[PDB]
Amino acid sequence: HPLLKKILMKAPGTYHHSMMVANLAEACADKIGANSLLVRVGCFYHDIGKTLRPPYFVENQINPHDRLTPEQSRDIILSHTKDGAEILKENHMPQPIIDIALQHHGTTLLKYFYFKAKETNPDVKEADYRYSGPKPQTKEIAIINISDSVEAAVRSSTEPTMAKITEIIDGIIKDRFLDGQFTECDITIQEIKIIRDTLIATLNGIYHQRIQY
């Protein structure tokens, strides 16, 4: 598997992140009866677009964005879905793996740099700081979108207790619902609740369970 080792060698922080997302998303897919094998493998590759400029993504970092404008930061980060899909395409990967790379942020807002730009232009359009999408077209991809955000959010949190983990997850699911990111797939509100509880249980295992005979 040349591609997966390319992520490992060029972007080991990203590599590590993707394996962790794969475990969380697979658990969720299992629990609602979705395509868990597809979810696992698609997570391996979802961030491969980051291999083009590894140090401009925080998990691979000294921050080179300090010497960049919001617009420049934006152009680099928003590209990684498109570039990832392009790489997988050129490497003749299965289409659903390619779709995961392209759609895993749906059309979400790149909040940090959006608000950094809004500091000096109150008229900045959200449109200019959103991924191109498409919005997740399947349950599997909705699952990945949430799991990816939860992994990263909990990993950067200070003291992720159960309550803290629960609040992080609920906040992400709230934002994705309100922002309409799941209106183009078949995921049910009950399934979202099952995903939420599964992520809570799984992260409880990962962050707090004593490993014992």
Ligand X SMILES: Nc1ncnc2c1ncn2[C@@H]1O[C@@H]2COP(=O)(O)O[C@H]3[C@@H](O)[C@H](n4cnc5c(N)ncnc54)O[C@@H]3COP(=O)(O)O[C@H]2[C@H]1O
List 15, 45, 57, 129, residue binding ligand X (CB under 6 A)? 57
- Our finding on whether 188 is near ligand X (CB under 6 A) is no
103/101 Cα distance (integer angstroms): 6
Does 17 belong to an annotated binding site?
A: yes
Residue 149 binds: one of Fe ion, ligand X, none (C-beta under 5 to 8 A by kind):
ligand X
C-beta of residue 77 within 8 angstroms of C-beta of residue 65: no
Residue environment code for 81-109, b if the CB has 16+ CB neighbours within 10 A, otherwise e:
bebbbbbbeeeebeebbbbbbbbbbbbbb
- Our finding on whether 153 is near ligand X (CB under 6 A) is yes
- Our finding on whether 100 is near ligand X (CB under 6 A) is no
Nearer to ligand X, 14 or 138 (CB): 14
Does 104 belong to an annotated binding site?
A: yes
Does 90 belong to an annotated binding site?
A: no
List 47, 140, 184, 191, residue binding Fe ion (CB under 5 A)? 47
List 82, 112, 118, 194, residue binding ligand X (CB under 6 A)? 112
Query: What amino acid occupies position 143?
Result: I
List 26, 99, 148, 191, residue binding Fe ion (CB under 5 A)? 148
Does 131 belong to an annotated binding site?
A: yes
CB of 119 to ligand X, least distance (A): 14
Nearer to ligand X, 52 or 152 (CB): 152
Does 47 belong to an annotated binding site?
A: yes
Residues that bind ligand X (CB under 6 A): 17, 47, 57-59, 65, 77, 105, 108, 110, 112, 148-149, 152-153, 156, 172
Positions at the binding site for Fe(3+): 17, 46-47, 80, 104-105, 148
Residues that bind Fe ion (CB under 5 A): 47, 148
Positions at the binding site: 17, 46-47, 50, 59, 80, 104-105, 131, 148
